[PDB]
């Protein structure tokens, strides 16, 4: 054996550790003693048994042994690094070839004048150094909760710097006693010095595995790439698909140019015959008994008026309106609320210094004297302060105030060192535990982590609620904050849960809605004037009281069945009926009016029966089409959409009944007591010669609208939902601006044994032997791609760490018994529950049987003050147990800011995706907002089926009545053009797709068929007098049933809507005006210009 060093030669400094004694290479080391060999192998390993002629003695191994142990806690987390760390120094002093890779440089004289090496040069393989640095790269310290490389390598970033800290001459701070040159440049041809090269280990090594938290290699690297979208190029994939179709499709058509079956099976034929006879009897009975039918209608609007007012009439809460109770997300919310309690009521308050940082001597002193008012002496009318309602982690501990005031224990820190004191707490919240023993992250409290330069702070107050007493407290808080007089240069934007249920029901848009409908009545009376010029006000006024009587009858009839009328019903239902119910007034009146001429059945009562007989079949067929469209939506899942599907289907059926029996009686009565003597629709419509041009223009419009379809965005911005100029406008605009923390995410695990070792390894995140794709590792690796980018609050890891023997303060039991040893008995009789040699980082002595609970109860009740690892404060309400098994548990994770509607839907997908990413765990992710955004997942395919199925109904409900497949297909061809055209202006007009929009898009089909169905039927059931040809019939219908549309639904809904543009609410202006102003212009264009041109070319 050859050694360049051996033995010990005094010390280089008084009152200091001794220094090795350099020796030349000529000498040979003596045989090691028995004691030295046993100690050397124990500290280093079993591989040293073969070698028994090392270059170290008893005095050297003991010194080396002591120095290795002191560094053991730092690197004990990752055994791979620990082995490498000890291997380097073990071969430094005991390698038989010590001088081969260690070259002495200078020698000095010690206190005894012996030989002591001042410095030496050590050479090693570059790859070996990289592996060593890689092994200890990401080791995480326990107490510091941060990278352990800082303490061992001084924050080194490369192996060259890290190794230098090891070899640097630092006699102070327990460092090395001499300088060591870890050079990386040597040649093997010297024949005297060879770079050190021995076994090395890495994190990925199967033998010396390391926890994923301690090394990236161990973490699950599979992580299959997430992809659930179809986009190609700068446009959506469907847009490219449609555009590509036009190019290729046009090629086939261009080359070609350059180069009713219903007679059979007359069962349907007889339908058009008996139906007219049936309505003739209804018309006959409604004209011969006008009083018997009018009294009942007046009686019905009295009995139903009784019900809608007194017997029962109720609205619904925001949760009921939006989310269906059967949705899987809501079923999960009930489980979370039932077990882990409802989520806290959050009352955010923002203090903003627009042009600088809020933190100052004036504001810090001022806010402390206003945050001590809200949380101390703000008794509401019921005389309940915040303390009564505030949320306490446990009864002993005070409640939580997520504000920077909680730093300094809520007391003034004096105007001498506030800047310095606040900075320290933010960096390490553990050492500044608030009065509730819960760490406060700086991201939540402050907008900017700089703290001193932060431009605002968050004063979120969390209430556990006390059964409607909390609801009353926010009233005082809401009033109090508004009345606050903040100093110059500051502003307050706040929020309170009462705001959503209070601010929402505060709009005064009824003024504009009432006026708009008032104008509709005024025009309707003047639009019923006779051909000569007489004005039938009594008929129009009475006719408008029948359409408004159907709403009351339906709105009161359903309240008899327990249905609740949503606030949406107050707008959509009146609009639909005033359109369906106004067309029938003009069609029946004009048909009678045209029956005044031609003197068919001169008798006044006969002129009406003929009028009903001619026009009722189209009215009934349109009614079935509109009933079928809404009835389909009744199969939807959302309750607000489902609610409308039931109201409209009834508000329209009742309208049909009152527009064929009650109104006919009014018409019969009015005309009889009036006895009026019989004294551009053709000039312009003669332009029908431009048939091909109209089809081309309207066909190009449809095709161009088909490529903008996939550009529609989902979601409903809440900022517009509430009335404008509110106190929320400066909050919602500020929650997306100065808030850097997203909603909490609760990874609820259910029915997992969590006692047998096998199950514990699926949640471990800090131990080695646990499964690679555990709950923590998977969620740790998903912090970089998913929207869930905040550390997991793993209680299982904390519980096991609490048992660590090194944490003597945390766990302590009385000797000879399992009784706990609280701080009230500081006598040193108590010892740690787990022995030093039992607990290991590789889950060796961890509880497996009933002992898991024997220590979980001790942990969960730990004070948490003596040491940061405790259970009472952080994880007392996180897990549900019954002394035998953990029924369920929760791992709070939290989202990222989520400051847009697209992000909100994106966040929900991550919860559903991650929830399903674990097939071995009965797990689900709960966040407060998940229930609201459940619909948007299937809102894409859903609206295809609801609208796609409605079109088929139009083609099938109107096929029997028309008995002409060609005319029925065209009717369904123009009804689909309207929605597709309206479906592309939604993207262009900035109207999103949601429940509020989905219902509106359904009544576009219900109202789109209203315009076109009448014209198509008159084109197919023309009287024998007119010629039987495409052009003549089309011209006849527009003269006959075209004026009833231009002066009826078209203008009636266009005169009132135009004035409706002056609505103040942003939600009403977006989803209810920009969509009912587009279906009255798109449908009017498509029914009065496209349809006459299309039918002529049927
Ligand atoms: C004439 C107009 C004013 C009638 C509108 C009917 C309202 C009763 C509906 C329409 C859209 C609904 C909103 C659509 C979206 C949401 C989801 C959600 O919005 C939020 O701001 C909370 C989001 C979260 O919890 O993170 C809570 C209910 C709310 C505001 C809804 C409350 C009830 C609203 C305002
Ligand atoms: C069941 C099938 C075989 C019937 C074929 C008849 C078609 C003419 C129907 C079937 C589905 C319908 C579509 C279903 C849904 C929509 C979206 C909707 O427009 C939008 O604003 C987009 C909404 C969205 O889907 O996100 C209304 C028109 C459109 C394209 C419909 C147009 C007419 C379509 C293509
Ligand atoms: C202040 C300490 C706690 C910091 C630096 C962390 C770990 C210490 C204990 C480590 C870091 C580098 C290590 C180190 C470098 C050099 C020497 C000199 C050698 O002849 C004996 C081993 C010894 C002494 C070892 C073991 C102990 C040291 C000094
Ligand atoms: C807000 O921060 C600013 C620093 O950017 C504080 O200082 C004054 O800010 C106003 C603008 O609001 C300027 O007009 C003054 O010139 C600034 N003075 C100084 C000395 O910087 C400001 O006081 C802060 N607002 C508070 C504490 O209410
Ligand atoms: C504590 O709760 C657990 C979980 O609910 C109970 O264990 C379950 O008991 C049901 C029957 O009630 C079994 O079907 C399950 O297989 C058990 N295990 C799990 C993981 O659910 C346990 O019985 C409860 N302890 C007491 C004393 O009631
Ligand atoms: C966890 O690490 C401990 C500490 O090394 C291991 O304990 C030793 O395991 C070997 C396995 O054969 C036994 O021969 C020893 O008697 C055990 N004790 C000691 C002090 O060495 C334990 O095996 C490891 N377990 C796992 C699963 O890795």
For this structure, the CATH topology of the largest domain is Multidrug efflux transporter AcrB transmembrane fold
Structural class: alpha+beta
Instruction: Give the bound compounds.
Output: cholesterol hemisuccinate, ergosterol, a molecule of 2 linked components (NAG-NAG)
Give the count of helical stretches: 38
Globally, the shape reads elongated
Number of domains: 4
Q: Please indicate the percent range of residues in DSSP E strands (runs of 2 or more).
A: 5-15%
Global Rg: 42 Å
The CATH superfamily title of the largest domain? Multidrug efflux transporter AcrB transmembrane domain
CATH A-level architecture of the largest domain: Up-down Bundle
> What is the number of strand segments?
17
Instruction: Report the biggest beta sheet as strand number plus sense, adding barrel if it closes.
Output: 4 strands, antiparallel
Percent range of helical residues: 40-55%
Distance between the termini: 107 Å
